[PDB]
Amino acid sequence: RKTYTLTDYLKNTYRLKLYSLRWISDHEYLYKQENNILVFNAEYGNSSVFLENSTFDEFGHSINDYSISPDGQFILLEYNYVKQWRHSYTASYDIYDLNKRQLITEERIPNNTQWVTWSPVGHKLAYVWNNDIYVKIEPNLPSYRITWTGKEDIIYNGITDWVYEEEVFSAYSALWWSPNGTFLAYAQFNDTEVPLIEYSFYSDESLQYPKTVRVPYPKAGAVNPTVKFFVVNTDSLSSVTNATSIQITAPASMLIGDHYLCDVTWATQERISLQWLRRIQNYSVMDICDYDESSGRWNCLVARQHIEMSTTGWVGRFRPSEPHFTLDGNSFYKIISNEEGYRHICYFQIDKKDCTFITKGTWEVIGIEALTSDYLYYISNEYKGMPGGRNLYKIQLSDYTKVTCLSCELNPERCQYYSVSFSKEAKYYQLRCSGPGLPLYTLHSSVNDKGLRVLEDNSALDKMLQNVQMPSKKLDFIILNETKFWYQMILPPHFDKSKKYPLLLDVYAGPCSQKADTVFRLNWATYLASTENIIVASFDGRGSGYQGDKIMHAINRRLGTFEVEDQIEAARQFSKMGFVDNKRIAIWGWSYGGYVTSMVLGSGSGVFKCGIAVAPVSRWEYYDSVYTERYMGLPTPEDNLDHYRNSTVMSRAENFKQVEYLLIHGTADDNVHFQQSAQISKALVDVGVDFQAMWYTDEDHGIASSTAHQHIYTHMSHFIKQCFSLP
Amino acid sequence: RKTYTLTDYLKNTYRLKLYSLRWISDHEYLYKQENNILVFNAEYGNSSVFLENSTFDEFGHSINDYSISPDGQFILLEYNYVKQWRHSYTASYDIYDLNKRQLITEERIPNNTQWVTWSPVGHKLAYVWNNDIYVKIEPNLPSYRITWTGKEDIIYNGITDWVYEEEVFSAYSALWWSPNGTFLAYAQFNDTEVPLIEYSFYSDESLQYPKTVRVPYPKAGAVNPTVKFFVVNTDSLSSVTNATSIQITAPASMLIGDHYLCDVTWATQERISLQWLRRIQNYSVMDICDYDESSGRWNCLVARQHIEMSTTGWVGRFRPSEPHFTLDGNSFYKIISNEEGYRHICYFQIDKKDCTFITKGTWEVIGIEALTSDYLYYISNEYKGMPGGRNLYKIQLSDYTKVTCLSCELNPERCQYYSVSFSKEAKYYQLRCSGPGLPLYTLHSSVNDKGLRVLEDNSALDKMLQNVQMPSKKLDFIILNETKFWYQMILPPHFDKSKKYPLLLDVYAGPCSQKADTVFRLNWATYLASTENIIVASFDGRGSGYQGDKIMHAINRRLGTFEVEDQIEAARQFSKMGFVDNKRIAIWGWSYGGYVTSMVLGSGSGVFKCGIAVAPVSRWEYYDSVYTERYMGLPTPEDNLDHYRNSTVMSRAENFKQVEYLLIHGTADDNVHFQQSAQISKALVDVGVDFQAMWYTDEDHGIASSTAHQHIYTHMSHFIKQCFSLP
Ligand SMILES: *[C@@H]1O[C@H](CO)[C@@H](O[C@H]2O[C@H](CO)[C@@H](O)[C@H](O[C@H]3O[C@H](CO)[C@@H](O)[C@H](O[C@H]4O[C@H](CO)[C@@H](O)[C@H](O)[C@@H]4O)[C@@H]3O)[C@@H]2O)[C@H](O)[C@H]1NC(C)=O
Ligand SMILES: COc1cc2c3c(ccc2cc1C#N)O[C@H](c1cc(F)c(F)cc1F)[C@@H](N)C3
Ligand SMILES: COc1cc2c3c(ccc2cc1C#N)O[C@H](c1cc(F)c(F)cc1F)[C@@H](N)C3
Ligand SMILES: *[C@@H]1O[C@H](CO)[C@@H](O)[C@H](O)[C@H]1NC(C)=O
Ligand SMILES: *[C@@H]1O[C@H](CO)[C@@H](O)[C@H](O)[C@H]1NC(C)=O
């Protein structure tokens, strides 16, 4: 048999298969296969061809992505894709009728549009061009302007600014249609007083002078952007006079200082939910607002207002959890950590402030996925008491003791990590199994809860991997200060406990992480074990997620303390197990893991020989406000400046004398500025420590352009092989 | 026994001694002992003690450098020196009185002062502050304001912008007293439409948002700064009425296009000479310009225009040569390249304009050092047909054929490399022998040409060095195309000719460079030969200078051609001598030889195992217009675009596949911008070539900071050691 090699991973020799589908009705879904968008049927297979390989064959453009209007007439066609940050990007748009086999020509959508969306019923459009919002009742009719305020790097109507895209909404889009599209809600951010990160972009070598990029980006302690919120009524627009947009202003609990808007969620045709959140992120307020068909303004009755606050840390996991209303929009289920530290479902009622918990236990609820008039469906890590694994549950709404696993025992040895995807009224759901066996995608009915057929079993792949010498995964735990803490090892094949193999520690360890899980992946780590016989290990100690607040909030206000000491104390444990060479212990990480790699090599620990750190944070005052202050407070004397300063990589430069270090960064990293590593290399130079570094011209935080991607992973390969002595 | 070590070199153990002085009369001069300013009579001994190793403990501030008034009465004092480009700085300035031992308070010279200088006779003063000229007649009294155009980054009055500073005057100063102190001329530089290089400066940990530095800088082709000249007189100044400057405008041979000011030289109290050079630098014009007691303006008579031009290449070694004038102002001597392309001395008489040559042969006048009614004194490389060497001669104005060498046989073994400084009217002079033996400082008398005393012979060092296994040096040549080309080698202690050594090839190789000399050096090569046993060898090939124009102009319009060829050629010669190990041959170099080293590695000859390039130029359109265009012409397709594009390091990427490369660059390089290396790296990553790289945070083109000077020489030494396989 052959061994998994570095090239298999770089030329992507052994591809996993998956089954991407869209639902479009309670009965039906879509699936391109050979570029043929088919329409599949859920009960039988009465299935039909919706769109040809070709058709658009003669577009003389690459169709970047597609979208159908939910009434079925039209299709949106996206191309000329030009990326911005993580989720943001600018594109060109053309619409196509399917009852007329024809494409629109008039009032078409202006090139370089920031975002496009359909209403949920019918075929109206909302789009954002040049920071402003536009609406199109019908695709061919002129477009209704809605804002004027929009200005590049100042005002943003209906799109997120830099920081709200990254660490709040995870989206560029900041619009929300009502259920039938009557209204359109939106958001407005203001960066006027927010300062600019500046950096260089070199480009094609043809370019003579290098460009500076200026991005409004508020670092810890700095002036942040502000947020306003409105709802406009789409069903009465005027050819003649402007559009009146009703502001639903925040509550006074929030208006007294820097706050954030963190959630927008419709309940009914005329009832919307808001969540807000103070800059000090331990205090959140929800608000339920009804339409007044007398004054078309919007009421949010203080009785219906809902508080959520934290005594042990910060509200939500990354943000306040999201509420799921019952069809009358008169109660709602929602994730809220109970009073033992564990995250479970609460059933609220629009007008009463106690909630009633419908789940109990030492395990957490990952997500509410769906809601009928007799069942709620949710995802937990309950099965066999493992926080690394995910499974699907339904709960009988007339009797909270009547509760049922639907995935656990379909096939428990191959399958332990499930997502679920629902038909438009939970008549059906697809299930996705990510591991530990080979992904298994399958289809089910909610009535019988009986599975109709297999969609994809990853068999092509199965057959090749009988040809490959492959690694093995212990997942298990160990006990400390009285507590279980999960790790995973990737073990080379024919792995023999006699022998003392070398050990790379793959780290992340930032708040609410999990690196110890039931998932199946072929990755770098697989190559190192398969081909270099290196044990790859990960470890979720304090800070880590899905195991309660007692374990998530340990690091609150004290980042770069317990997550570092825990990575170190787990390496100790691994040495003492004695199939590990206690002189060949290395460590690596990226982003937050690169920081923690950097703090651990700075620690004077004795334990590690080699380190590699990729776009690491080195000093929290350099990261942005919204992520940083959530866990750190504000960097003033009056609050938490002191930990801010003890917690910097720079203060540890002299101890790298004891280790071999490698430091890599993109020159054009918007997220964690090159600044951050600049400051590290400088401190190590000024106390005379030798070390290695690669810059990567013009890459960002992902370093994911194909060629940079082959370089880095090779370069790091050479460094590990080199320090471990592998020939 | 012990050897010369990286640490001796970095920590600067074995120090030379120089004997600097300041002639301040025809027969007296200053100089420190420790902390203490003596004046020394020349005839015999009088020491006088001009100032004390105390006196200035009084002062508070951290004094820096001193200047004295011609009439000997005042002394100017520098502090808060705050470093800028390569000659440009800012400082503060207090004036002490020497007759009193008082200190001027009422009306001083403000902080952040840019340049300041005494007139040549008496106690008159001119300075520049926010780009404006100011004169003081008396140091106790109210400054006179000369210009009001000055403006940061656009208008430079009495001082150079970045291009004139680096590439023409090698000076921040652009003022010119008349010899008796009356008139004062200055240059005004414009920079309105010169575009702007932009780069990051991180400063201390404590700075939260980096700083973007913005500097006006023309690259190849770009828009240059234009230039204007003026004379103003200093006896007729008015305190009611603003102060008049007379323009003197360039000749119309120059005015039709882009052109530069390349030299300013006063001949009489009322006659000035101005040299102009075209943008395309194969054509210069000299003007000679008398006063006019009646009009008040300056008259540049056109019988007195001397046109120097070129056809093999460019005018000058790097610019037009300077004139030395006959006391009366009516004739001058100037070095010019003759009909066979050797530089020698020409007598000109202002009205007739064919110069007569005073010297000839197959060797070259380095420079003209002094003029008496009787003799001309010059430095040259004639002695023994050796361009490496340097020696002082004198020639009789009454009879050319009669020329004495003042330095040749003085001390023939130890001393072949001379420089000189004469007293106010050439009665005495100091000699400076800088190699091949230890440096040796002496005093001489004109009338006798008498060897008065030895001022310093460095025997302190001489003892020390008899404890160490010092390397040895060979200087010598080879013959290519029936022409001599000089190499020097640094050879290890107890060099054994039957052995194989690895070989590093130090490189510069720029136009009119010279690496093969008889100078004496303690440097990184010293360390590499004595301690790690490497032969370190440089080579003076095509382009190199002081050997005339057939060799020098060979690269005309054609950089990165022959000089690269010849660097490979030289390494090939050396390996066939049979004490070289064909498998271990490196190359490296900073600045120009960074480029030359890159292009060698990128050439795919295979002769070089590995290489290191420090701050290289990778592509000529990234470099400044003045130096670049001087050797390439213009990057238009109606001039030299095709070579500009063929001569890039980046188009040689796929060959770096046969080599271990190490690329290094200061992030704040204001000259060769980090731009240049960024494009190299990107190129290599694209074709997939492993290399190693290092940035230096906020260092510039020198990487001179104490700690970084150390970091890089240590990093580089490791890299070579890897490559030659040495511990
Ligand atoms: C340094 O160099 C600068 C240019 O590089 C120079 O500034 C002159 O040039 C700028 C271009 O940057 C010009 O804008 C300006 O001159 C012109 O200004 C107007 C254009 O915006 C134009 O209307 C003017 O013409 C008018 O007035 C003149 C008389 O004043 C008449 O000839 C015209 O008919 C018309 O009525 C004018 O041509 C700048 O003067 C800086 O001055 C220079 N600084 C130095 C030398 O100190
Ligand atoms: C907006 O929501 C999220 C943001 C998340 C983020 C996560 C990791 C998980 C997240 C998960 C959610 C969620 N859900 O990590 C990101 C992150 C954290 C770092 F320390 C860092 F150096 C770079 C970086 F991108 C951070 N900027 C945003
Ligand atoms: C204006 O005067 C000079 C400038 C000189 C210069 C010399 C080398 C010798 C010089 C000699 C003189 C003289 N004389 O080289 C310098 C130089 C050349 C390069 F290719 C480069 F990348 C950087 C660099 F500083 C260039 N900036 C100016
Ligand atoms: C955005 O905020 C800025 C503060 O600089 C203010 O001047 C401007 O009026 C605001 N724009 C709005 C809210 O329309
Ligand atoms: C000198 O000229 C400047 C600017 O051109 C002007 O402001 C000033 O009045 C003049 N100075 C005096 C003292 O008249």
Side-chain angles (χ1 to χ4, degrees), chain B residues 149 155 188 190 192-193 226 228:
Chain B
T149 29
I155 301 292
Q188 147 169 276
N190 211 325
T192 310
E193 322 207 83
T226 59
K228 284 189 207 136

mmCIF file of all heavy atoms in Angstrom, chain B residues 149 155 188 190 192-193 226 228, ligand 1:
data_model
loop_
_atom_site.group_PDB
_atom_site.id
_atom_site.type_symbol
_atom_site.label_atom_id
_atom_site.label_comp_id
_atom_site.label_asym_id
_atom_site.label_seq_id
_atom_site.Cartn_x
_atom_site.Cartn_y
_atom_site.Cartn_z
ATOM 1 N N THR B 149 8.925 81.173 0.560
ATOM 2 C CA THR B 149 8.284 80.095 -0.219
ATOM 3 C C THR B 149 8.284 78.725 0.492
ATOM 4 O O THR B 149 7.371 77.937 0.305
ATOM 5 C CB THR B 149 8.910 79.904 -1.608
ATOM 6 O OG1 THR B 149 10.283 80.281 -1.579
ATOM 7 C CG2 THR B 149 8.177 80.715 -2.620
ATOM 8 N N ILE B 155 8.537 72.648 -1.089
ATOM 9 C CA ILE B 155 9.498 73.659 -1.400
ATOM 10 C C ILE B 155 10.697 73.637 -0.502
ATOM 11 O O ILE B 155 10.593 73.830 0.714
ATOM 12 C CB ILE B 155 8.874 75.035 -1.360
ATOM 13 C CG1 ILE B 155 7.727 75.087 -2.356
ATOM 14 C CG2 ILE B 155 9.909 76.092 -1.730
ATOM 15 C CD1 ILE B 155 8.165 75.018 -3.809
ATOM 16 N N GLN B 188 16.686 76.478 -4.876
ATOM 17 C CA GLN B 188 15.289 76.169 -4.465
ATOM 18 C C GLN B 188 14.728 74.981 -5.253
ATOM 19 O O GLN B 188 14.629 75.029 -6.501
ATOM 20 C CB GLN B 188 14.348 77.383 -4.645
ATOM 21 C CG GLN B 188 12.897 77.056 -5.023
ATOM 22 C CD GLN B 188 11.991 78.256 -4.930
ATOM 23 O OE1 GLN B 188 11.502 78.562 -3.858
ATOM 24 N NE2 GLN B 188 11.755 78.937 -6.048
ATOM 25 N N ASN B 190 11.641 72.312 -6.178
ATOM 26 C CA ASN B 190 10.198 72.113 -6.197
ATOM 27 C C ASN B 190 9.864 70.625 -6.209
ATOM 28 O O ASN B 190 10.624 69.817 -6.742
ATOM 29 C CB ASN B 190 9.576 72.802 -7.413
ATOM 30 C CG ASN B 190 8.164 73.287 -7.150
ATOM 31 O OD1 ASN B 190 7.404 72.653 -6.417
ATOM 32 N ND2 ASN B 190 7.805 74.417 -7.748
ATOM 33 N N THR B 192 6.093 69.737 -6.065
ATOM 34 C CA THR B 192 4.623 69.684 -6.150
ATOM 35 C C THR B 192 4.095 68.385 -6.725
ATOM 36 O O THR B 192 3.382 67.668 -6.028
ATOM 37 C CB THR B 192 4.080 70.856 -6.984
ATOM 38 O OG1 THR B 192 4.672 72.073 -6.492
ATOM 39 C CG2 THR B 192 2.525 70.944 -6.922
ATOM 40 N N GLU B 193 4.463 68.063 -7.970
ATOM 41 C CA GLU B 193 3.888 66.903 -8.666
ATOM 42 C C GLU B 193 4.771 65.665 -8.693
ATOM 43 O O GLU B 193 4.508 64.760 -9.456
ATOM 44 C CB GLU B 193 3.525 67.248 -10.101
ATOM 45 C CG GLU B 193 2.948 68.628 -10.273
ATOM 46 C CD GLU B 193 2.044 68.701 -11.476
ATOM 47 O OE1 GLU B 193 0.860 68.310 -11.325
ATOM 48 O OE2 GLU B 193 2.509 69.137 -12.561
ATOM 49 N N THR B 226 11.784 69.903 -10.296
ATOM 50 C CA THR B 226 12.503 70.961 -11.009
ATOM 51 C C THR B 226 13.361 71.794 -10.079
ATOM 52 O O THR B 226 13.314 71.620 -8.857
ATOM 53 C CB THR B 226 11.510 71.884 -11.685
ATOM 54 O OG1 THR B 226 10.648 72.438 -10.666
ATOM 55 C CG2 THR B 226 10.728 71.076 -12.732
ATOM 56 N N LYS B 228 15.552 75.749 -9.266
ATOM 57 C CA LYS B 228 15.929 77.153 -9.451
ATOM 58 C C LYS B 228 17.069 77.644 -8.545
ATOM 59 O O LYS B 228 17.216 77.161 -7.395
ATOM 60 C CB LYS B 228 14.744 78.042 -9.176
ATOM 61 C CG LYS B 228 13.726 78.073 -10.276
ATOM 62 C CD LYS B 228 12.723 79.162 -9.987
ATOM 63 C CE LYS B 228 11.377 78.874 -10.616
ATOM 64 N NZ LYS B 228 10.323 79.193 -9.617
HETATM 65 C C1 LIG C 1 6.579 74.886 -7.936
HETATM 66 O O1 LIG C 1 6.011 74.342 -9.105
HETATM 67 C C2 LIG C 1 4.606 74.447 -9.200
HETATM 68 C C3 LIG C 1 4.197 73.682 -10.457
HETATM 69 O O2 LIG C 1 4.916 72.467 -10.545
HETATM 70 C C4 LIG C 1 4.194 75.925 -9.209
HETATM 71 O O3 LIG C 1 2.790 76.120 -9.201
HETATM 72 C C5 LIG C 1 2.264 76.642 -10.434
HETATM 73 O O4 LIG C 1 1.837 75.556 -11.212
HETATM 74 C C6 LIG C 1 0.613 75.045 -10.741
HETATM 75 C C7 LIG C 1 0.470 73.594 -11.182
HETATM 76 O O5 LIG C 1 0.711 72.754 -10.072
HETATM 77 C C8 LIG C 1 -0.447 75.965 -11.330
HETATM 78 O O6 LIG C 1 -1.732 75.573 -10.902
HETATM 79 C C9 LIG C 1 -0.186 77.428 -10.946
HETATM 80 O O7 LIG C 1 -0.199 78.270 -12.093
HETATM 81 C C10 LIG C 1 -1.490 78.355 -12.758
HETATM 82 O O8 LIG C 1 -2.614 78.324 -11.889
HETATM 83 C C11 LIG C 1 -3.881 78.190 -12.523
HETATM 84 C C12 LIG C 1 -4.217 76.719 -12.785
HETATM 85 O O9 LIG C 1 -4.810 76.144 -11.642
HETATM 86 C C13 LIG C 1 -3.945 79.015 -13.809
HETATM 87 O O10 LIG C 1 -5.252 79.509 -13.988
HETATM 88 C C14 LIG C 1 -2.959 80.176 -13.762
HETATM 89 O O11 LIG C 1 -3.051 80.913 -14.968
HETATM 90 C C15 LIG C 1 -3.721 82.185 -14.817
HETATM 91 O O12 LIG C 1 -2.910 83.183 -14.237
HETATM 92 C C16 LIG C 1 -1.688 83.442 -14.907
HETATM 93 C C17 LIG C 1 -1.046 84.653 -14.240
HETATM 94 O O13 LIG C 1 -0.858 84.393 -12.867
HETATM 95 C C18 LIG C 1 -1.857 83.704 -16.409
HETATM 96 O O14 LIG C 1 -0.633 83.433 -17.054
HETATM 97 C C19 LIG C 1 -2.938 82.859 -17.078
HETATM 98 O O15 LIG C 1 -3.307 83.469 -18.293
HETATM 99 C C20 LIG C 1 -4.161 82.692 -16.182
HETATM 100 O O16 LIG C 1 -4.832 83.927 -16.033
HETATM 101 C C21 LIG C 1 -1.536 79.638 -13.595
HETATM 102 O O17 LIG C 1 -0.977 79.376 -14.866
HETATM 103 C C22 LIG C 1 1.112 77.614 -10.130
HETATM 104 O O18 LIG C 1 1.567 78.944 -10.255
HETATM 105 C C23 LIG C 1 4.746 76.589 -7.956
HETATM 106 O O19 LIG C 1 4.472 77.971 -7.978
HETATM 107 C C24 LIG C 1 6.248 76.373 -7.909
HETATM 108 N N1 LIG C 1 6.825 77.017 -6.745
HETATM 109 C C25 LIG C 1 7.942 77.744 -6.762
HETATM 110 C C26 LIG C 1 8.696 77.951 -8.045
HETATM 111 O O20 LIG C 1 8.360 78.262 -5.732
#
